[PDB]
């Protein structure tokens, strides 16, 4: 099976990520993740913190996953693109998820909290089976760094 | 096996999509789709209609597919990019395919009909086996909406 | 298994690609490739030659692979993006690898040799097992063109 594990880092993110074990019944390939804070995107590159730690497992083994823009991220009011096309995250990374978002416009752009700009897709485009939202400071073995 | 199903919506698109069952002998991963109309791309975001309905099947089950730019889309004469890197389409969608194309230049850009700017790639990068072009108003069960 | 094969074309690229058979022990999905020459990226589209020939094999059969930007390519000092989101290369191509890189800034950008801007990922996001660096003018059967 293919399972995702998301743990909020800040207490602000915990309001959007309450603990549960969602079964992905409707076969949605992507896992939407929230902007847990209001943010102003200046023209050019922006580093957007997602306030979450993510691990994805395939066949009982930790695997990589992809960060992809949602159709909602780019509109006529805000020309936003992911800087690196799609973000690849290796299974060894156990830190906070960060986005590189380019504001192609010439004026600052405001994004509001609860807005989902990106989605997480597992390596090989495997549809997830469960999406576990772990509580804030649960010590999870998949989030322990393992220098190779 | 992996099979694609394309049905033109307009009669203008039918000239470019005549009915047949192509066997993908040459293992081409992508399925080119035409701009069935001349269009002017203003600077910034553009919504480009593709005048087709698409379904993709893997192992007898409906799956998702990806919209990806072709190497031909961006040239020195026209700075065009897909707005969301690559477009993900869930298997439940049975509507017309739409592109979000960003014109990064400062002057309008003209695209002519028959030009193929994007290609369709199945979930998991599975090379297709057949590419079925269904006639305009054939009622196909894979194009019937099924609210989940 | 999944194996990559890289052969430098120029003698300048050979300094960065010395011959060996690396076993991908640390399960890195991507294969970093170097800019083997200093280059100036003008605003707009740039054609960047990588001075390498690449073949990727999956289950003893030649397959396609994807060119993806690294997190290092886009920074606050240089707004660079791959023009076509991610580059798809069909298994039939046996020529030199070329990048379409868009400089979104208004002033030229300098990239230095040994800098890795992109990475190669196999079709289906299969983690490689070996990364073979073939010497400059070894005649390899996977690099012989086979018109289909």
Author numbering:
A (entry chain A), B (entry chain A), C (entry chain A): 2 to 149
From the study:
ASFV encodes a dUTP nucleotidohydrolase (dUTPase) (dUTP pyrophosphatase [Dut]; EC 3.6.1.23), called E165R. The enzyme degrades dUTP in the cytoplasm and thus minimizes misincorporation of uracil into viral DNA, which plays an essential role in maintaining the fidelity of genome replication. It is indispensable for reproductive infection of ASFV in swine macrophages, the natural host cell for the virus. We show that E165R is a homotrimer and can specifically hydrolyze dUTP.
The structure of ASFV E165R was solved by molecular replacement, using the structure of P. falciparum dUTPase as a search model, to a resolution of 2.30 Å, with Rwork and Rfree values of 22.2% and 25.5%, respectively. The structure is a closely packed 3-fold symmetric homotrimer, with one E165R trimer in the asymmetric unit. There are 447 visible residues (residues 1 to 149 of the total 165 residues in each subunit) in this structure, which account for 90.3% of the intact protein, and 16 residues at the C terminus of each subunit are missing due to the poor electron density. The E165R protomer in the trimer is mainly composed of β-strands. The 14 β-strands (β1 to β14) form four sheets: β1, β2, β6, β7, and β14 form a parallel/antiparallel mixed sheet, β3, β8, β10, and β13 form an antiparallel sheet, β4 and β12 form another antiparallel sheet, and β5, β9 and β11 form the third antiparallel sheet. One α-helix (α1) and two 310 helices (η1 and η2) appear after β1, β13, and β14, respectively. By comparing the substrate/product binding pockets of apo-E165R and the E165R complex, we found that the binding pocket of apo-E165R is much larger than that of the E165R complex. As calculated by CASTp, the solvent accessible area and volume of the binding pockets in apo-E165R are 249.3 Å2 and 163.2 Å3, respectively. Only their C termini show obvious conformational differences, suggesting high flexibility of the C terminus of E165R.
